[PDB]
Amino acid sequence: QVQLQESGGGLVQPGGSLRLSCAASGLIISRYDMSWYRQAPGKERELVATTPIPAARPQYADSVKGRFTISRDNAKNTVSLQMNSLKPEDTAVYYCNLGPESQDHNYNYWGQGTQVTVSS
Amino acid sequence: QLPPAYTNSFTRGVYYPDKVFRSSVLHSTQDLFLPFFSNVTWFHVISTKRFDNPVLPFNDGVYFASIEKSNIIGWIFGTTLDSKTQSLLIVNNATNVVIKVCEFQFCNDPFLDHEFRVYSSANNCTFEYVSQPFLFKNLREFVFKNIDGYFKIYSKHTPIREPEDLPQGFSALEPLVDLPIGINITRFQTLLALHRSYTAGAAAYYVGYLQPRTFLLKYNENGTITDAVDCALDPLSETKCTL
Amino acid sequence: EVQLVESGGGVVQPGGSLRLSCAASGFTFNSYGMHWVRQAPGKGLEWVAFIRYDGGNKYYADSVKGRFTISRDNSKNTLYLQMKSLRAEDTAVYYCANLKDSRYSGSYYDYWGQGTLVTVSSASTKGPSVFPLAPSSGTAALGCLVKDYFPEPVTVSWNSGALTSGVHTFPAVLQSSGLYSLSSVVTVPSSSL
Amino acid sequence: VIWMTQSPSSLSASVGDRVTITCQASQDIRFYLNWYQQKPGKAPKLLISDASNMETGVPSRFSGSGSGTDFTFTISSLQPEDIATYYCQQYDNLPFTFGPGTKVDFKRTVAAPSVFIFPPSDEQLKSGTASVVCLLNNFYPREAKVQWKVDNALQSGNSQESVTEQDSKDSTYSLSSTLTLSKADYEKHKVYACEVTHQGLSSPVTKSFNRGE
Ligand SMILES: *[C@@H]1O[C@H](CO)[C@@H](O)[C@H](O)[C@H]1NC(C)=O
Ligand SMILES: *[C@@H]1O[C@H](CO)[C@@H](O)[C@H](O)[C@H]1NC(C)=O
Ligand SMILES: *[C@@H]1O[C@H](CO)[C@@H](O)[C@H](O)[C@H]1NC(C)=O
Ligand SMILES: *[C@@H]1O[C@H](CO)[C@@H](O)[C@H](O)[C@H]1NC(C)=O
Ligand SMILES: *[C@@H]1O[C@H](CO)[C@@H](O)[C@H](O)[C@H]1NC(C)=O
């Protein structure tokens, strides 16, 4: 009965600041390595961010360095992403689920998602 | 030295092996586990000085349990417990925890003040971590592992009629910390805080050792382990494991 | 307190097999690794075999490799040594050891057993035979001799045991025939006669 | 495999003298060394661990140092209860290895042996065998030499020697030499010489035996 709901997104000017929140039901975040994913028109899917178990650091992607921050609130089962300035070519839909090392062969689940767009 | 005492382990010591999500499946895993219905040692602190803090082997992993009424119990891990090698110190201060990896020179009786009377010198410090404290009567259980250059801690805390034997029930230990240290560990010791006289207390703990074994674990729809069976325990469980 | 007791010593013909048992009391036996140590009569110390806390990995020396076996029965706190294809060079005294090590078995304390004697020979038990020596009359010269007896101990008695003087007992030495031989003190305080 | 060497093999010291022993390894073992002590008829006892760390109850006079290949063991003042054999053990790599050993004694001035010779008895001759015996009583120094001469001839393989331990009251030894002869070849030669050589005598002493006598 896992269910993931993402909130926070819409139309913004270039170089804004957004906070995306993830609400998880039926899942305990303290036990898994969570991540943030992105997919763009014709771009298939590519990883964006990862948040490992404590006593380890976040691992971003090469082309996204120094533009996003991640948080993990274990008490209320929340994963949040804080948005720094971005180029207008970053408009896409963003997903919230487990990381690549926390998924089996038989895992096909994806929540609704949130749209973010930069108006240029 | 006081004689040792033993108690039945029962169905205790089960932890999450990996970080993968599994729901509504039965999974067979070969890993390091505490065998069911094993005997574990029990340490008292009873008041020509008293030596109630022995140095014990680490082997391939440790299961630690405490049932203290008040907080008397940190830990030291290492090989030589002197300045020739590096050691790991975990101290649970009133507000924060401190985890350090340095070359220490530990005293003969490393006690605490209810503070830095644990070591006389600490040089070549290569790790330092501060975070929230690890915290009626409560039963606190820990599992320590040291594998592939990683120190892994698993913890569980359950509020408690008869305390003579460990309870008969099932609970799974959850991950706490995965420290990226790279030292060798073969010995470990426990730290006790002694209130200054104007000193002992109800400090009792249980130590057990893990062995390579195959287990069958049941996962519920939310990802929680509900039941576990040991394959080599008895012929009856062998039929269940064979399937 | 801590006590280690060994059992199984005795006499074995060449080509035979033997089994030595060791019991531990007073300390947690299932948390440590254990060693077998042997010492030859009138020689140094040697290291035989090592076993871990849960059985499993077992280590043997190069001399006793391929014909010795080590095992532990943790239910009854027992350690075993099985010996096959024995030869005359294995005559020694054996101990069970818990050795202090900062590497491998991280024991902070060391304990040793009592010891058991294993003798490999083809000669049966026999009683001592005595031949005196000519006494010449400090200038007190005399002679006694014990010869041709297998089993290691001996009963010492010179003159009904009234006096403890003349107590220097020469150690027995093994012969090519297969049996032992000794002697006894010659001169005594000449103020008693 | 690792070889272990100790030096010296045998030592003698007086009361109040500093004693030093050395142990050497075939390859580097860092500071993973142990020093033992054993008295006759008893199991060994551990003194120094990790090449520098002593143990609870060990008197302050003992000490140890060294690293790598060379290690050293030291005693400051030699109390009477320090007669034993000391071994050095390595535990860097399985299989483990002990050392040969070093023995320690007490020293005392030179003494003089009282060498006696004894012929076989008639009861020995009644059973078809005989043994001749030479006795060296109460000589301090360990090294002494006894030779059996049959008409000024050198022979070996028929002689056996027995030496006792130190005697507490006087710290002195005793030695017995035995030579076996058959009943057909015991009195055929008159010249049976027992020659004793030691540093306690001005000249070597030879005592002869008379056949039949
Ligand atoms: C799983 O969790 C959900 C919400 O947290 C809960 O409604 C459901 O009953 C749980 N499943 C169980 C307890 O089997
Ligand atoms: C330890 O706890 C005391 C309690 O007041 C606090 O003052 C101190 O700052 C703590 N130690 C550290 C390193 O913060
Ligand atoms: C490590 O220890 C050595 C020896 O004490 C010292 O010389 C060196 O400066 C230390 N390095 C540090 C503290 O970074
Ligand atoms: C730690 O153990 C490994 C395993 O053999 C060994 O290779 C390494 O040398 C040890 N560490 C040190 C500092 O010796
Ligand atoms: C625990 O101790 C009891 C009593 O000594 C013994 O019968 C039992 O076999 C022990 N448990 C194990 C797993 O050996």
Side-chain angles (χ1 to χ4, degrees), chain C residues 35 39 43-45 47 50 59 95 99-104 110 112-113 130-134 140-142 145 168-171 173-175 186-187, chain D residues 30 32 34 36 38 43-44 46 49-50 55 87 89 91-96 98 116 118-119 121 123-124 127 131 133 135 160 162-163 167 174 176:
Chain C
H35 312 249
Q39 177 175 45
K43 287 219 177 308
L45 288 176
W47 179 88
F50 172 55
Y59 302 97
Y95 311 93
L99 295 180
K100 170 150 157 180
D101 285 322
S102 315
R103 186 186 283 261
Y104 304 111
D110 77 309
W112 290 64
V130 174
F131 314 105
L133 303 159
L142 54 85
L145 173 83
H168 287 163
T169 61
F170 290 161
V173 65
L174 186 141
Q175 314 185 149
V186 160
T187 307
Chain D
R30 262 149 280 173
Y32 302 107
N34 278 351
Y36 286 91
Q38 178 189 28
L46 183 62
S49 176
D50 278 329
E55 284 187 348
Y87 301 89
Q89 167 206 334
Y91 53 97
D92 198 38
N93 166 53
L94 283 165
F96 298 156
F98 279 83
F116 290 164
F118 307 118
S121 50
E123 192 168 1
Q124 210 154 7
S127 294
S131 54
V133 176
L135 176 53
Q160 276 207 84
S162 179
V163 177
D167 173 44
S174 178
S176 85

Side-chain angles (χ1 to χ4, degrees), chain C residues 156-190:
Chain C
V156 189
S157 45
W158 182 259
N159 210 2
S160 178
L163 305 95
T164 193
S165 189
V167 72
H168 287 163
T169 61
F170 290 161
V173 65
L174 186 141
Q175 314 185 149
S176 59
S177 61
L179 318 168
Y180 289 22
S181 295
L182 295 91
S183 289
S184 283
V185 169
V186 160
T187 307
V188 296
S190 310

Side-chain angles (χ1 to χ4, degrees), chain C:
Chain C
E1 311 171 354
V2 183
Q3 178 212 45
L4 291 167
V5 169
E6 310 99 313
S7 179
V11 178
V12 176
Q13 305 219 316
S17 66
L18 204 64
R19 184 177 178 179
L20 302 168
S21 50
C22 204
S25 66
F27 75 110
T28 304
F29 175 78
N30 307 357
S31 75
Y32 294 112
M34 300 286 279
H35 312 249
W36 269 106
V37 173
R38 80 168 168 197
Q39 177 175 45
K43 287 219 177 308
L45 288 176
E46 211 175 347
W47 179 88
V48 175
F50 172 55
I51 199 163
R52 287 183 53 108
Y53 71 109
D54 66 338
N57 296 115
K58 292 174 275 289
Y59 302 97
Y60 312 101
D62 295 3
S63 48
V64 302
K65 185 171 70 69
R67 60 186 184 86
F68 273 34
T69 296
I70 188 169
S71 63
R72 74 194 303 152
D73 188 39
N74 275 358
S75 177
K76 308 178 71 35
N77 287 1
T78 305
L79 190 74
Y80 296 94
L81 170 77
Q82 171 88 32
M83 317 181 41
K84 280 179 186 177
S85 70
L86 276 175
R87 65 179 64 88
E89 89 177 21
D90 298 308
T91 304
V93 167
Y94 290 70
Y95 311 93
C96 311
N98 176 26
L99 295 180
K100 170 150 157 180
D101 285 322
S102 315
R103 186 186 283 261
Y104 304 111
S105 68
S107 199
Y108 199 70
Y109 315 102
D110 77 309
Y111 309 116
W112 290 64
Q114 299 310 113
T116 43
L117 178 68
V118 162
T119 304
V120 177
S121 69
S122 50
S124 64
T125 315
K126 183 183 175 158
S129 170
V130 174
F131 314 105
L133 303 159
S136 299
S137 293
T139 66
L142 54 85
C144 183
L145 173 83
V146 161
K147 192 178 182 294
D148 294 340
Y149 80 99
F150 177 83
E152 58 89 18
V154 76
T155 68
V156 189
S157 45
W158 182 259
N159 210 2
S160 178
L163 305 95
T164 193
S165 189
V167 72
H168 287 163
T169 61
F170 290 161
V173 65
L174 186 141
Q175 314 185 149
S176 59
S177 61
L179 318 168
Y180 289 22
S181 295
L182 295 91
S183 289
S184 283
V185 169
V186 160
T187 307
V188 296
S190 310
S191 56
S192 65
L193 306 169

